[PDB]
Amino acid sequence: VQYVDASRIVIKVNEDEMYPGEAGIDIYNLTKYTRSNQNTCINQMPCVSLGEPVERGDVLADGPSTDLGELALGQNMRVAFMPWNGYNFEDSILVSERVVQEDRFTTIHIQELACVSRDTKLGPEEITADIPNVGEAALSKLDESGIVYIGAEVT
Amino acid sequence: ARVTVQDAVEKIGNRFDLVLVAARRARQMQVGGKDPLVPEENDKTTVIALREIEEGLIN
Amino acid sequence: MPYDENGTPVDIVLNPLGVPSRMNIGQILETHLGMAAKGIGDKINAMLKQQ
Amino acid sequence: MVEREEAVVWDILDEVIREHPVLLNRAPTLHRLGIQAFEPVLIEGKAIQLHPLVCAAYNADFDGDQMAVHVPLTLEAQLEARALMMSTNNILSPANGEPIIVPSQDVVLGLYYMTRDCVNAKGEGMVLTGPKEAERLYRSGLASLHARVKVRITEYEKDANGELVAKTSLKDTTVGRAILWMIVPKGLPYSIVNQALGKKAISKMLNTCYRILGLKPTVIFADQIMYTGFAYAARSGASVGIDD
Amino acid sequence: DGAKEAEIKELLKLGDLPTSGQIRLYDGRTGEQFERPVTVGYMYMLKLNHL
Amino acid sequence: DTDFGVCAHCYGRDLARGHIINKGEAIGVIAAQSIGEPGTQLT
Amino acid sequence: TRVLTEAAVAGKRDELRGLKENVIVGRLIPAGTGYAYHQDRMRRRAAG
Amino acid sequence: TEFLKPRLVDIEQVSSTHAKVTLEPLERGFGHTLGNALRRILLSSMPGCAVTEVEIDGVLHEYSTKEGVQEDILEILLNLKGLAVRVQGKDEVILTLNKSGIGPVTAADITHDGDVEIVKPQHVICHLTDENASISMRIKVQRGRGYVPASTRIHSEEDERPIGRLLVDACYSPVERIAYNVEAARVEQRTDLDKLVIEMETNGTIDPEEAIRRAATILAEQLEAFV
Amino acid sequence: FLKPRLVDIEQVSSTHAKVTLEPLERGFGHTLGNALRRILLSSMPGCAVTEVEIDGVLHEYSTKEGVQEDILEILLNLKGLAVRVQGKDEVILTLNKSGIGPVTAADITHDGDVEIVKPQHVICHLTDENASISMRIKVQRGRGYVPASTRIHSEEDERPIGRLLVDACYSPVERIAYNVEAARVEQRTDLDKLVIEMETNGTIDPEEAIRRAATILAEQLEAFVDL
Amino acid sequence: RYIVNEVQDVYRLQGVKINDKHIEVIVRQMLRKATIVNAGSSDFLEGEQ
């Protein structure tokens, strides 16, 4: 591996398999916390650390529901079988506060909100750049353009 | 302790005329027309008229 | 959490009443080998902290 | 004030809910037994809780039953909820005169483990005069919940014109059945509860308590049962065995 | 033709586990041992996307 | 003998209740649902 | 539209004696809790 | 770090049957650390008094016949096991019961000592039927802690070698039914705390509220070494 | 009731230790056992990094060109960092590093109060040399588990896009069990010894914690002595 | 009485026990109209209430 980052996987390839035509190296840009079909966070994660060669047809990155090239759907831990004060009634499972206290079991749902605009026959639509009858609070979160700064939190 | 109204259906047996009677007494209680006579304990007025059904002074 | 002879808190509690009906037998066998996959880990871990 | 989530209006929230009943309903419901009423309880969360055994009435498991819980605004509907639509009143099916709700299963194995006979019994032979010290024997841990104990159950029977006649009797019962008396209202006799308790036994069991003693005893009795059903279900211990 | 009884038992007894895999746990709210040790272990989960 | 309806007697008492059927209790609709309730069950 | 014709030409005077009817007009049926309600109402109609 | 101070203790009280100590505030796991701890105390160890052993001077058995009482001698033992008695400046006192005559006998015949504190003399023991029947029994009340079943720690009087001491179980804890009831409470904007409602019932000697502070004094004992 | 007292507290490691009390009575080893476990699992002075403002990173869903792991994962390793403090209830550290290498819990600007239990805990790796990362680590001390979700109503106005907030998990303990056995006193019917096993991340001392537990239990004795 | 026997038997294949009161009001419903036989007042064959 030549330059392992989180967003890129630069491989300094061995010459016995490196192309005798314009040398060559392996660059792989990993999907970064993007949106999926089910609006769930998909992110290829760099498993191979810096300072380690690889085999041909081997792996460099994992993805969600997968770990170190192994299909990991959920998580496994200490389970016991006993009807405990109705907390296992009909379908009910009883869980230790530890899971949410660790949040090793949390899903990140990212949402894409398309903004329609651009020229109507009655007014050449711009992306605001100014909001009437309200304060500068609506713009202290936006810029001169009217686009909210990357890194905020809405609700 | 109150949880069932077996007692109430016994007095005004049509189970729906019960609804009629108690409801109206509840509103006289709402409006300061009157006030509760049979001691209440945070009960909304529908429930209080129902106490007057079990005591039997009002039906 | 119900604890064993050692004091390890359990994480999940399920209903035993569904085993005979639903007939989830392979489910419990994987539980024991899963407990065995961690049982051997228990050996390693202790003796590995001892260096 | 609610904009600031001010504690004041949450107390006024207490004034508009603590005795203001609600109606409940599910979408897939096709029957009238699927529309019932209860009293609200302020639970901090996002999901509508319920009394376990009533789910069988709605025929609602835990597979995604989204309920639309309605609010009786008018005086009429509020009383109508607590009247005919009260859970504790429609304890019979309009199809047949049998108790609509039968104790599911978790509850019953708990009491199967209550009234139960096992040959190896710790304290198998002692005597008690009160089901309350029976509590002090198993909930403490010194005795088993199966020991064949001779106890004096001074059971009662409304053989009078409404009065429960006093009749003394001693039974070769098990520890759990003595504790089962702490559950069983006087009016209901110990003879019916000197049985291993099955799903069908406990079915007609609640029905007899109704035809005999009444509805009120039965309602708050089944209530007792629910708590202790799941209670000793935990106290049960024995759950599943590969060796079996 | 997967893991058999004596095969899973060979692994349980290679760690620190008994034949039955029914370990002695005490009540999480009290401390009294659940009569006839409860069957325990590690099960693998699966969370459907129903939130 | 009651036209445009039924008498409490000819009906009875059985329902969720166990008492005399009321004048105002529309048996029509409840009959409908309780015969079609086991509809999902019939095969 | 069938119903239009069906009762329009006959001018069938149905005094709101059915449940379904009572509900589309949003009024208490002469049964249940509207029993004694419409009891006063029925002897107040064409009678008194 | 922040701490809470227990306030608003709405004591729902009824003379002697039960006291229900409503009280706030309890974060997740405190109506537990306390409620179960109390029921543990009330079923296993509560320094009180009770009858340890009773020798029926008449017929030394419990399944045999004593023509005088319609109840059996075994039923007589039941009666004994549950009587709320409480000695004070003594570890053990022996008393006597002497009744003769036709009638349902009350507990007004057992000797009242400066130590012996029979709370309810109206307590009907044995139902004496036809003809006098000179029954006499030596009831042995002792000071104990919790509950001691006469079966492992037995005395060598006339029961281990001879047969005559119809040993009873000493209900040292003057309680009947114990049950903690945790429920969702709220400190206005706060998430759900627990409004611990403790339904506790005592038989007669000790009154509900004093028992709560008596056990509290015993709980004080338990951590005096720290704070 | 004869009072309990601590015998030698078994201090073996920083990770785990065992407090031990000899003079316990009949069943009180079980009694206080579960009782105190609730205490040691809820009201516990723990430390937890809460705010991590970063030099170049705006949102924890980015990757600084130079750092190895994703920023969100690096922050979960910060949740996995065990540190105890002494006076300050709020303190900020500063990670200053540039050069290829695993950054353990030593390279941070270690404050006098700030004290890591195991400085060998690598948090993140660096793959580039000319990668200057400077981040302020705002850690505070409270108790129990407090998520930024429950704290988002106040929010403290986080308009400045550089503020990253992770969960404040003030939980020192990890695995608690208690060892009950026959106390070997030479003159008494029975007593119980209690060797309370406590597993820790390695930040709060056993006896310090038990006196705190007694203090919390002290508040909890107040009301029940005064009905 | 014939049909209530039969259909109830269907409920026997379902094991459900439902009181025929409801099934019989429905039978009454299906017989609420009747073909007149005698003439004189209205018709000689009117399917009427």
Closest residue by Cα to residue A77 from A52, A54, A105: A105
Amino acid identity of D214?
G
Residues of H with CB under 8 A from a CB of I: 1-7, 9, 11, 19, 21, 23, 27-30, 32-34, 36-37, 40-41, 44-45, 47, 145-146, 153, 191, 209, 212-213, 216-227
Q: List D residues 62-101 in contact with F (Cβ-Cβ < 8 A).
A: 84, 89-97
Determine the residue among E43, E46, E50, E51 to mutate to test chain A binding: the one whose Cβ has the most chain A Cβ atoms within 10 Å. Answer: E43
Answer whether B53's CB lies under 8 Å from B43's CB. Answer: no
Closest residue by Cα to residue D84 from B25, B17, F27: B17
Neighbouring residues of F14: CB distance < 8 A, sequence distance ≥ 6: D94, D96, D97, J19, J21
Q: How many helices (H) and strands (E) does chain I have?
A: 3, 13
Cα D139 from Cα D239, distance rounded (Å):
19
Closest residue by Cα to residue I59 from A152, A31, A5: A152
Identify the residue whose tokens are 């009587």: H83
Cα I32 from Cα H225, distance rounded (Å):
14
Q: Tell me whether residues F27 and J22 touch, CB distance under 8 A.
A: yes
| DSSP string for residues in B3-55 | S--HHHHHHSTTSSHHHHHHHHHHHHHHTTT---SS--SS--HHHHHHHHHHT
Q: Tell me whether residues J21 and F42 touch, CB distance under 8 A.
A: no
> What residue in D sits closest to F33 (Cα-Cα)?
D31
3-state secondary structure of A2: coil
How far CA J23 is from CA of D96, F33, I45, J16, in Å, comes to 13, 11, 70, 14
Answer whether I181's CB lies under 8 Å from C12's CB. Answer: no
Answer whether H61's CB lies under 8 Å from H73's CB. Answer: yes
Cα C31 from Cα H71, distance rounded (Å):
57
Neighbouring residues of D224: CB distance < 8 A, sequence distance ≥ 6: D183
Cα A13 from Cα A1, distance rounded (Å):
8
Please compute Rg for chain A using Cα positions. 25
Neighbouring residues of I154: CB distance < 8 A, sequence distance ≥ 6: none
Pairing of strands H184-186, H192-194: antiparallel
Identify the residue whose tokens are 């009795």: D221
Cα B26 from Cα A14, distance rounded (Å):
90
Cα H217 from Cα H214, distance rounded (Å):
5
- The dihedral built from the CA positions of residue D197, D203, D204 and D208, taken in this order, carries a sign that is positive
> What residue in F sits closest to D98 (Cα-Cα)?
F16
Please compute Rg for chain G using Cα positions. 13
Let me know how long chain C is: 51
Pairing of strands A61-62, A45-46: antiparallel
How far is F22 from chain J, CA to nearest CA, in Å? 15
Answer whether I193's CB lies under 8 Å from I22's CB. Answer: yes
- The dihedral built from the CA positions of residue H172, H174, H177 and H180, taken in this order, carries a sign that is negative
Cα F14 from Cα F6, distance rounded (Å):
15
CA G8 to chain centre: 16
CB atoms within 10 A of CB D76: 19
Cα D232 from Cα D145, distance rounded (Å):
10
Give C39-43's long-range contacts (Cβ < 8 A, gap of 24+).
C39/E11, C39/E12, C39/E14, C39/E15, C39/E16, C39/E17, C40/E11, C40/E14, C40/E15, C41/E15, C42/E15, C42/E16, C43/E14, C43/E15, C43/E16
Closest residue by Cα to residue D109 from D243, D242, D231: D231
List the determination method. Answer: cryo-EM
Beta bridge pairs of residue H192: H186
Resolution stated for this PDB structure, in Å? 7.9
Angle of CA points D118, D120, D121, to nearest 5°? 85
> What residue in D sits closest to E35 (Cα-Cα)?
D237
Please report, to the nearest 10 degrees, the dihedral formed by the alpha carbons of residues D137, D141, D147, D150 taken in order.
Answer: -10
Chains D and C touch (3+ CB pairs under 8 A): yes
Please report, to the nearest 10 degrees, the dihedral formed by the alpha carbons of residues J36, J39, J41, J43 taken in order.
Answer: 60
Cα H142 from Cα H50, distance rounded (Å):
6
Pairing of strands H47-56, H192-194: unpaired
| DSSP string for residues in H172-204 | -S-EEEEEEE--EEE-TTS-EEE--EEEEEE-S
Three-state secondary structure string covering H25-69? CCCCCHHHHHHHHHHHHHHHCCEEEEEEEEEECCCCCCCCCCCCE
Cα B15 from Cα B7, distance rounded (Å):
11
Angle of CA points J5, J9, J12, to nearest 5°? 140
Neighbouring residues of F24: CB distance < 8 A, sequence distance ≥ 6: B14, B16, G30, G31, G32, G33, G34, G35
Amino acid identity of A123?
G
How far CA A36 is from CA of A4, A43, A105, D189, H220, in Å, comes to 25, 10, 18, 64, 60
Identify the residue whose tokens are 């003879």: D191
| DSSP string for residues in F1-43 | --TTS--HHHH-S-SSS-SPPPTT--HHHHHHHHHSGGGTT--
Cα E22 from Cα E36, distance rounded (Å):
8
Cα H74 from Cα H64, distance rounded (Å):
9
Cα E38 from Cα E24, distance rounded (Å):
6
Cα H84 from Cα H86, distance rounded (Å):
7
Let me know how long chain I is: 227
DSSP, res A137:
H
3-state secondary structure of D181: helix
How far CA D16 is from CA of B31, D46, D125, E40, in Å, comes to 18, 19, 56, 47
Pairing of strands H197-202, H175-181: antiparallel
- The dihedral built from the CA positions of residue D209, D213, D214 and D216, taken in this order, carries a sign that is negative
Cα I205 from Cα I40, distance rounded (Å):
12
Identify whether G30 is preceded by a cis peptide bond (ω within 30 of 0): no
Cα I17 from Cα E15, distance rounded (Å):
25
Residue J14, token pair as written in the block: 């379902």
Q: Tell me whether residues H186 and D43 touch, CB distance under 8 A.
A: no
3-state secondary structure of D232: helix
Q: What angle separates helix J21-29 from helix F27-35, to the nearest 10 degrees?
A: 110
- The dihedral built from the CA positions of residue I75, I79, I83 and I84, taken in this order, carries a sign that is positive
Answer whether H149's CB lies under 8 Å from H38's CB. Answer: no
| DSSP string for residues in I173-201 | EEEEEEEEEE---SSSS--EEEEEEEEES
Closest residue by Cα to residue D167 from D149, D155, D159, D183: D155
Neighbouring residues of E14: CB distance < 8 A, sequence distance ≥ 6: C36, C39, C40, C43
Cα D110 from Cα A82, distance rounded (Å):
11
CB atoms within 10 A of CB I106: 11
3-state secondary structure of H219: helix
Q: What angle separates helix D75-83 from helix B17-30, to the nearest 10 degrees?
A: 130
Answer whether B7's CB lies under 8 Å from D83's CB. Answer: no
Let me know how long chain F is: 43
3-state secondary structure of H93: strand
Angle of CA points B8, B12, B14, to nearest 5°? 110
For chain B, the chains sharing at least 3 beta-carbon pairs closer than 8 angstroms are D, F, G
Backbone angles phi, psi at A78, to 5 degrees: -55, 115
Determine the residue among G33, G37, G38, G39 to mutate to test chain B binding: the one whose Cβ has the most chain B Cβ atoms within 10 Å. Answer: G33
- The dihedral built from the CA positions of residue D217, D222, D224 and D228, taken in this order, carries a sign that is positive
Q: Tell me whether residues E49 and A40 touch, CB distance under 8 A.
A: yes
Residue D50, token pair as written in the block: 């319920």
Q: Tell me whether residues A82 and E38 touch, CB distance under 8 A.
A: yes
Cα A126 from Cα I63, distance rounded (Å):
32
Chain H residues lying within 8 Å of D129, measured CB to CB: 78-79, 81-82
Cα D179 from Cα D164, distance rounded (Å):
21
Closest residue by Cα to residue F17 from G28, D185, D85, D200: D85
Query: Residue ranges of the alpha helices (H) in G1-48?
Result: 2-8, 19-24, 35-42
Q: Tell me whether residues C6 and I177 touch, CB distance under 8 A.
A: yes
Chain I residues lying within 8 Å of H28, measured CB to CB: 42
- The dihedral built from the CA positions of residue G19, G21, G26 and G28, taken in this order, carries a sign that is negative
> What residue in H sits closest to E30 (Cα-Cα)?
H36
Burial of residue I168 (CB within 10 Å: 0-12, 13-18, 19+) is: buried
How far CA I40 is from CA of H226, I200, I212, in Å, comes to 15, 11, 10
Answer whether H137's CB lies under 8 Å from H126's CB. Answer: no
Q: Tell me whether residues G32 and F29 touch, CB distance under 8 A.
A: no
Beta bridge pairs of residue I182: I192
Q: Is F7 annotated as a binding residue?
A: yes
